């Protein structure tokens, strides 16, 4: 069925965008580690 | 096949819940920016 194939193609695109945002969040969450290390270093 | 259509409907629901938690994490991760700005402002 073309309706099923089109729905699968739409799900594949959503998962690709979801996977990209997770990798970005992982990188952005690494900043929060550096940001707290910078506050602790500059203060202490 | 109804089994394939039911599996697609289950995947669509899981992606909808996954997409909602990512947007929540993005908002909750913005708090961590404010929280570090509040610590740096109150201390420095």
């Amino acid at each position, epitope marked *: 069925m073309k309706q099923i194939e089109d729905k699968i193609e739409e799900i594949e695109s959503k998962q690709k965008k979801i996977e990209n945002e997770i990798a970005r969040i*992982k*990188k*952005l969450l690494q*900043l929060t580690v*550096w940001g707290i290390k*910078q506050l602790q270093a500059r203060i202490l | 096949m109804k089994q394939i259509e039911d599996k697609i409907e289950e995947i669509e629901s899981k992606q909808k819940k996954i997409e909602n938690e990512i947007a929540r994490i993005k908002k909750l991760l913005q708090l961590t*920016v404010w929280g570090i*700005k509040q610590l740096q402002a109150r201390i420095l």
Partner: antibody
Amino acid sequence: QLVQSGAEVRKPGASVKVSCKASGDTFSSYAISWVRQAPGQGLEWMGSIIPLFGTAAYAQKFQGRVTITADESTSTAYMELSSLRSEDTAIYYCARDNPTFGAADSWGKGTLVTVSS
Amino acid sequence: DIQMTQSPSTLSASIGDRVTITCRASEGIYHWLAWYQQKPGKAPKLLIYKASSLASGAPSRFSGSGSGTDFTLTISSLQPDDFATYYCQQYSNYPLTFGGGTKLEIKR
């Protein structure tokens, strides 16, 4: 990718402010560090900003006379060094600390700064 | 802070040989270490991040290892492009500190 300001010449006891412009994607989820290298000497770290937080961490030997700022509206990073001395003459670089790697991937061309009378 | 000691400061080797240099930290830094290569009149170029993961464009002959305090950069077969100065840098905690530096000389 990383464009800096032109060369500068100052007198001792005076200050300087060097700019370094990056992309908008750099000012979001990345960090910029300032590293200098005297002629013939080795690399020496000075400080870094985490632009999305406004935090900064400087070096001990430079603590009190170094100031690093960054405005996200122009995506430019500024480095201000006060109480200049003759040994401060060095080539100052700006690198983009990449958190996923834990290292600096892109670098700038470097700026010729001379502290002499 | 954390002190990075590069031994040796200079090295003399010929093309095709294998060379091994170290970069010891004053305290435990896990895999946080970044190796660089600088040419005269050039900005440093990133080679190895996380002490093992090679970077983009870095040829496979380079090599990183070590964790905690003792680390090691090694090359399998030297080539004229490989002869330059190398600086290690830790990212465990601030302030970030570089190493002394290891200049690679062409033996003749």
